Amino acid sequence: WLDLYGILGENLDIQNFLPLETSKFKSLTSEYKMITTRAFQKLTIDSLKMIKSSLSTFLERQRRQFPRFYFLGNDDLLKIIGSGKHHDQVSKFMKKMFGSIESIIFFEDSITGVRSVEGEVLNLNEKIELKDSIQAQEWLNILDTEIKLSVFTQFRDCLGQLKDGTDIEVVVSKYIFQAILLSAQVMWTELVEKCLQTNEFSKYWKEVDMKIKGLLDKLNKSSDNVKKKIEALLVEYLHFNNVIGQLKNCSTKEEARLLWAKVQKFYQKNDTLDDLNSVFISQSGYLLQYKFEYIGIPERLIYTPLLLVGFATLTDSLHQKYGGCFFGPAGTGKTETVKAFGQNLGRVVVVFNCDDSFDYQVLSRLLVGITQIGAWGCFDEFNRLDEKVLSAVSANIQQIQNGLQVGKSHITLLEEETPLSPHTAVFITLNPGYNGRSELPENLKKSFREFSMKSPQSGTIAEMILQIMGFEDSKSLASKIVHFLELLSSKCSSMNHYHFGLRTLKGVLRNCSPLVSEFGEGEKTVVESLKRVILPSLGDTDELVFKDELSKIFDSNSKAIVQCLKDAGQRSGFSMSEEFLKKCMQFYYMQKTQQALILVGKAGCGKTATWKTVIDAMAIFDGHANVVYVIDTKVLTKESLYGSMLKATLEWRDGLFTSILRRVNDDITGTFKNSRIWVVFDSDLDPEYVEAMNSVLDDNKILTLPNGERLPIPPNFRILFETDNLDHTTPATITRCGLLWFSTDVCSISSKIDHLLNKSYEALELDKLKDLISDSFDMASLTNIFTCSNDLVHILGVRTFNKLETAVQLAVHLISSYRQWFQNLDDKSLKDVITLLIKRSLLYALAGDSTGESQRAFIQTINTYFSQELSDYSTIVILSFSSFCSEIPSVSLEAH
Amino acid sequence: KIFSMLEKFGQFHWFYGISIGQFLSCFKRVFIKTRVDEILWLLYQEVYCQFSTALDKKFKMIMAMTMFCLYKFDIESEQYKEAVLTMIGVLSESSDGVPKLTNDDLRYLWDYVTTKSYISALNWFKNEFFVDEWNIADVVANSENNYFTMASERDVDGTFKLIELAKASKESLKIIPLGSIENLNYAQEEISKSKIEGGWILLQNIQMSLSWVKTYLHKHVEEHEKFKMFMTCHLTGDKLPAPLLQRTDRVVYEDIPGILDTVKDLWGSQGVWSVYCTFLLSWFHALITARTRLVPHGFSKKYYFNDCDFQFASVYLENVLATNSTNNIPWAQVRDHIATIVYGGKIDEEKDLEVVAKLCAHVFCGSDNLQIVPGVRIPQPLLQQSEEEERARLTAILSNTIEPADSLSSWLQLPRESILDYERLQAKEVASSTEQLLQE
């Protein structure tokens, strides 16, 4: 009702657009006011949902007014339009609309600036005056323009200050990262062109090396914002030094010119009166325009040669307004390359995770959303789309390309004429050669320019990243890391889930980032990170291979967490053996940095027993409450898991995972701020179900819904995968998640027996009965009985480890049932009775799924390995042991 | 006999079916366009020129050889038939034996097959008997029917050929790809509007809306002079209805087998330095597309170089020649960009990147005396010519080129034995199919 009153019930001259909807809204408002008055002194929700249908065209026109509303849900659109005086509602959707802005800084009914996701503060040139008369779209448009102008102004100020002759180390403390980055790039390309006019490169190379050393020294004593900015400028300056050193080592002038032409150059027009079109970016003879959209301080990428060639081919495709296309195996730098190209072009690339649910209407609506905005659209995993949709949207994509190339003002898609911004572009990052993925038609493939990135450059990435972290020996350490990864990939068992590519190296570096405080930036840190990342995903012999090669190539307390685990297991009745504690160590260490985890082993090996007790112990250790949403993936349908588009009225219905993500994002009651959220997928890892979460699981950490909604993944929102086999899983969903392989059962046979026992007793004198039952149990003969049970023929083959449950529940239930007659007999008779009951329970739990002759053999062997003897027809009546022949009643059936 | 052969072809592949109405329309065209032999010869020429476009390259060669065999066996004597059959058998590796010497073309075929030039031996029948060929434009311009179906394998599309044909015919194409109900409704409305008003219409990927194709398209083709319809399907896709296919003209679009033919096609599809760079790019594209089909030896996989790569490389060449007006053309930059960005983006294996880099170094070496092929040399343009003069000079030096019989090895700079194996296998397949076809 607040949203309805905001859109229609409060604003004037807004009820004259839809008079029938105006009358319906007035009637609903009167009914709600009457209900509220009655309460203060079902049907309403149904009426509201009925009048939502007439609001769809109004919402579509509102999205047409401000094109960035296409990335918002209908409820979010209602909230943002309705809140016309509070003005703090709009700041919540800044990340959904822009991507790099988390909120808006407000000061006395005015807009001072915006704040980036990482915490960077950008101050606007002119404070926007906000009044109750104005509504969202106008001041949002002028805020977008003001942000672009502020970015340009800070760029110009930083560039002028650097041209004055001052060093960058004093300028990085003044302006935003984007301004420093672009001004430094312009200065670098100007100075390199000046040096290339001559034939001297050593002087500028030495100057750049001194700048890099000064930045590295300044990084050690700066704040977190300044540290991130210095790290990103250090990435850019290392790229500068690499290019200058490559130019210096060049033999002749022509090859130096070719090398300079192959790399991005950041020029600036000195005669254009338009401020935002004053900077153009050059590579391979082509020119692209800087947009001056806010970027913030993103995780900058290392400038590998593959990255530069990908930038060159993206520029080659975009020069003719064609689409950019990246293909290759998983974890090779396609989506991140596109995002880095966008960041270098001064705009946030909007990434879409394609899926089977994206039909022609959904994909075309996303296309009209991104063409009206002018944003750069990346369609991640374009193969996952159905082939029919791929053929259908080819016309729309070709129309977008033709309109961009011919400068058409409007393009007609989805039976409507909408404006086409000239700043838009389309990118696709597909993964050919994978099962469960369709093949793009050639008429669609000719609309994109495809580039292959099968093999990245892990050595350069590792070297530059380790150098930025502050490592004294970086080249040798990076070479050792890459060589160790290669030997681990080559000299291990060739089973499908062993991938040692770029993603695991990035995970090793990210895990080596935070323990340098107490291990030190050396070799112990990197070997510990390598262990913590790779060892959980290795088997039994491959673990020994890991140890051997680690000792070959690399020469070189956690008491509280162990205590917390032990306390949690004691509360849960588990036994802390070496294997269980090792698995819990591995899970805790690999969940400390990796947010998505897969647990793989045999059925009943102890995956749930591991993650439950680790979660409990972390709740003890950190004091944070834990919420767990265990979802069986394949029980539900994909439309029932993520959501479905109702074709009756083109409205969105949430799934289960989407509902949980929206509930944790909304934070209505404020109890999810300081809690860890676990979503466990306890089913088979279907590529169709799971690969729809590709953008969720990687560094994007976003859920791209069909209706354009972009739900972020909070840092405390973690996803667990529980399964047995990775036979059908693709490497795309394997590399993204830290994998914890269960080589064997984490529990001994007797420890599992004891856990089932005391769990049954807790589910229920009693201590005497428990002690007598345990004394009846004899592990020395129990192990031999279990070993001899393996020789029997079993239908529906169940491991003997899994059959202890049925035996324990049968024994405990029999004792509880017969406890009524357990106070009028001697200790020996009681022991014999309990022994017979446990023997029949073991019989019908171990050999109960076998033939009668096998059951006779098993009762014979359980008699020889045990005590009251139990026969094939032994029984207890009401408490004397007898047989079946005295229990049969006389039956004389009638004729009918 | 020809109708039985075409029925056998339609038995082999669903797209190759033949209707009696189409054959009788061809027979009528024979008269629309020693006498009885002349009508028979014109019948053979017309049936080849019309129903060759509906077959791919191997079936083209098979049908050309079997029509040549039929005509020449009926006309000539039994010794000629025995000689031709022995040459086919030694091409099929079934009956190894020298032919009995008599005429003149017989020794030409014998020289082609003894020098292990299997491609020339296969195309000798086409070069000797038939003296005309049809492309998509000829099929459209010589058809009373207004409905057309074009088929090609996956990872190749002939939509750009139809767009070029519509541009040359001053018509309008409404490209409506199929696969969704909105596209189907738009196609229905556009079909009605184009029937009433005029204009062409192309449906793309019709094998993907098979229910709509089986009902609406079947009923519509079952029942304006400037209205034409085109539909694209895949040869490896799901089977299309026979009644719909038999009522439409069928075309198989496939890349030109020749090297010099591809150069001439790309040259005719288009200051002096721009023309020179276009000539060099066309030669490079033809050479790389010729080397592409050699799966294990020329490259490491099967690649697909199409008109988009040619367009992008030509645009890059024009931009380089536009921003470098000091006549110091960065030939190394052009080589690196064409080998790495334009034509190298699809290349996934590093050794194939090396061979395409070698090809670019050979083609775009930037030398005054460039020898792109062992026979033809391309001198650099002077500074006192014109664009038309350069166009004419390059066309003239293209016309004097004669492609040899061993051009799949010498022109591509490849070992001879791999070409021997490839040509031998292809000729064995073609001749075995023709032998299995002729005896019945």
Ligand SMILES: Nc1ncnc2c1ncn2[C@@H]1O[C@H](COP(=O)(O)OP(=O)(O)OP(=O)(O)O)[C@@H](O)[C@H]1O
């Ligand atoms: N450390 C332990 N101490 C005692 N019992 C244990 C321990 N670990 C596992 N178990 C026993 O193992 C049984 C099966 O383990 P768990 O419930 O973790 O299976 P799971 O990994 O979820 O298997 P599945 O994939 O078949 O569902 C539990 O019921 C429990 O009794």
Ligand SMILES: Nc1ncnc2c1ncn2[C@@H]1O[C@H](COP(=O)(O)OP(=O)(O)O)[C@@H](O)[C@H]1O
């Ligand atoms: N210079 C770089 N190039 C590519 N990836 C990099 C680079 N530096 C770091 N990375 C990391 O490597 C990972 C590669 O992921 P990526 O291959 O882009 O995903 P996708 O498989 O969807 O293309 C990213 O998470 C990124 O953080």
Ligand SMILES: [Mg+2]
């Ligand atoms: Mg991706």
